[PDB]
Amino acid sequence: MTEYKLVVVGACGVGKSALTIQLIQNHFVDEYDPTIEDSYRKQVVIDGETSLLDILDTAGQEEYSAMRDQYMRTGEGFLLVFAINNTKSFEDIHHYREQIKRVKDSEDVPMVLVGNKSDLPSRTVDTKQAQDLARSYGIPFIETSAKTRQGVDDAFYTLVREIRKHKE
Amino acid sequence: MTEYKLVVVGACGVGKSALTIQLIQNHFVDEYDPTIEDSYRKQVVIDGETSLLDILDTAGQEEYSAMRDQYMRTGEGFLLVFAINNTKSFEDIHHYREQIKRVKDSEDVPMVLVGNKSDLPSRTVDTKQAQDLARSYGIPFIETSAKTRQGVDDAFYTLVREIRKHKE
Numbered sequence: 001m002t003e004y005k006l007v008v009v010g011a012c013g014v015g016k017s018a019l020t021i022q023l024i025q026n027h028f029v030d031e032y033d034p035t036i037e038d039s040y041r042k043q044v045v046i047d048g049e050t051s052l053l054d055i056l057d058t059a060g061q062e063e064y065s066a067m068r069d070q071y072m073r074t075g076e077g078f079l080l081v082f083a084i085n086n087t088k089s090f091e092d093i094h095h096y097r098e099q100i101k102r103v104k105d106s107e108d109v110p111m112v113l114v115g116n117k118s119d120l121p122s123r124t125v126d127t128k129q130a131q132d133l134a135r136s137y138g139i140p141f142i143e144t145s146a147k148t149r150q151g152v153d154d155a156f157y158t159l160v161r162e163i164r165k166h167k168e
Numbered sequence: 169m170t171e172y173k174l175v176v177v178g179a180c181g182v183g184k185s186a187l188t189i190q191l192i193q194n195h196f197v198d199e200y201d202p203t204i205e206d207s208y209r210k211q212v213v214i215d216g217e218t219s220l221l222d223i224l225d226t227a228g229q230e231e232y233s234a235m236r237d238q239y240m241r242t243g244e245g246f247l248l249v250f251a252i253n254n255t256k257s258f259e260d261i262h263h264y265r266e267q268i269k270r271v272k273d274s275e276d277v278p279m280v281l282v283g284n285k286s287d288l289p290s291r292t293v294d295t296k297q298a299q300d301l302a303r304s305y306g307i308p309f310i311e312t313s314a315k316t317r318q319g320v321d322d323a324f325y326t327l328v329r330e331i332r333k334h335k336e
């Protein structure tokens with residue numbers, strides 16, 4: 001069976017760990033140590049086909065990192081997470097995408113844009129702005145809430161779909 | 169001296185001809201026949217260096233065209249023109265960029281986004297939308313008016329600068 005390496009990226013505090021732990025362990029973590037950077041395994045069936053996912057939840061500092069570059073080289077798809085109430089996190093998505101392009105020397109890398117914290121009653125990033133960003137990049141967009149679990153499986157499943165398409 | 173093939177693209181009526189004729193002949197045309205497709209020569213000096221420009225003002229139909237693909241293959245830089253009072257023209261920029269990517273096998277070819285008819289207050293496309301689009305594409309954005317000549321030289325000169333960079 002196919003095995004894929006997924007990487008969850010995004011600004012500090014946007015919900016990378018919360019999304020990943022919801023997927024893997026089916027609970028919401030409200031105080032997950034911000035420096036824990038680890039990989040989690042999950043076997044999934046998506047569109048009738050099984051895949052083993054190795055999901056790296058990233059947690060480095062704002063600095064150039066050779067190790068991060070290695071994670072980018074090994075990663076096959078990237079979840080680009082921002083929080084819908086944090087404009088900086090949305091602006092910085094661009095920079096994170098450029099990092100991936102630099103390391104992988106490619107603009108066709110599998111990626112999905114994820115607007116997390118959709119359960120919140122206020123937002124500073126409008127949905128249309130996010131949809132237009134994703135359209136400009138040629139990638140899917142999905143809104144999630146790690147807190148209510150809304151869209152969590154679909155975000156990761158969509159990324160797998162993007163990886164499969166690329167590998168074909 | 170170096171010679172570059174430039175291509176001016178954009179939806180019907182956005183001001184491709186008016187922009188091109190302002191650059192070449194220094195006057196504003198009101199009713200230029202919409203099917204005239206032609207190339208114009210212009211020697212320019214940009215940042216102290218001279219270049220010979222061969223500028224194609226496009227005027228085909230909405231259809232796949234083998235001849236258009238040949239113009240894209242030989243084109244070295246593209247002006248992506250929309251009109252700020254024509255939302256369709258702005259939406260369709262994306263499609264026109266994808267056509268160039270198709271033909272050029274996804275090359276990162278020089279392009280500049282041009283928001284024309286900037287003198288008009290009947291705007292339907294927000295400047296911030298256009299800035300963000302250009303940012304996502306990694307290209308400059310220039311506001312122009314072929315009517316007042318605002319930005320006209322600078323749009324074409326910026327495209328030349330992008331070509332010179334690409335060829336380095």
Ligand SMILES: Nc1nc2c(ncn2[C@@H]2O[C@H](COP(=O)(O)OP(=O)(O)O)[C@@H](O)[C@H]2O)c(=O)[nH]1
Binds near residue numbers: 010017119145147148
């Ligand atoms: N309301 C809301 N809060 C969330 C959501 N996801 C994460 N959080 C909160 O944001 C904080 C940071 O989440 P975390 O996953 O640790 O961020 P990371 O630095 O991106 O890994 C968490 O403690 C939660 O308080 C969500 O979908 N909704």
Ligand SMILES: Nc1nc2c(ncn2[C@@H]2O[C@H](COP(=O)(O)OP(=O)(O)O)[C@@H](O)[C@H]2O)c(=O)[nH]1
Binds near residue numbers: 198
């Ligand atoms: N007000 C204004 N009108 C313009 C501008 N550029 C073009 N036009 C007018 O828009 C119409 C279409 O221009 P044209 O250059 O023929 O468009 P093309 O089909 O893209 O070649 C004509 O009536 C032009 O005079 C501009 O910057 N401002």
Ligand SMILES: *SCCCC(=O)NC1CCN(C(=O)COc2ccc(Cl)cc2Cl)CC1
Binds near residue numbers: 013059071095097
């Ligand atoms: S939470 C405490 C502060 C630390 C912080 O701000 N870290 C940031 C998080 C975002 N970041 C990225 O580089 C995101 O993009 C990444 C990360 C990891 C990989 Cl493998 C690929 C990309 Cl594109 C910088 C540090």
Ligand SMILES: *SCCCC(=O)NC1CCN(C(=O)COc2ccc(Cl)cc2Cl)CC1
Binds near residue numbers: 180230239267
């Ligand atoms: S006023 C014109 C009447 C008909 C019309 O709607 N023609 C459109 C204009 C836009 N178009 C494109 O394909 C634009 O993109 C182009 C054109 C030419 C080249 Cl070489 C490259 C690109 Cl990306 C369809 C026809």
Ligand SMILES: [Ca+2]
Binds near residue numbers: 058
């Ligand atoms: Ca974390």
Ligand SMILES: [Ca+2]
Binds near residue numbers: 138
């Ligand atoms: Ca794509």
Ligand SMILES: [Ca+2]
Binds near residue numbers: 185186201203204
């Ligand atoms: Ca014309």
Ligand SMILES: [Ca+2]
Binds near residue numbers: 305
């Ligand atoms: Ca660029």
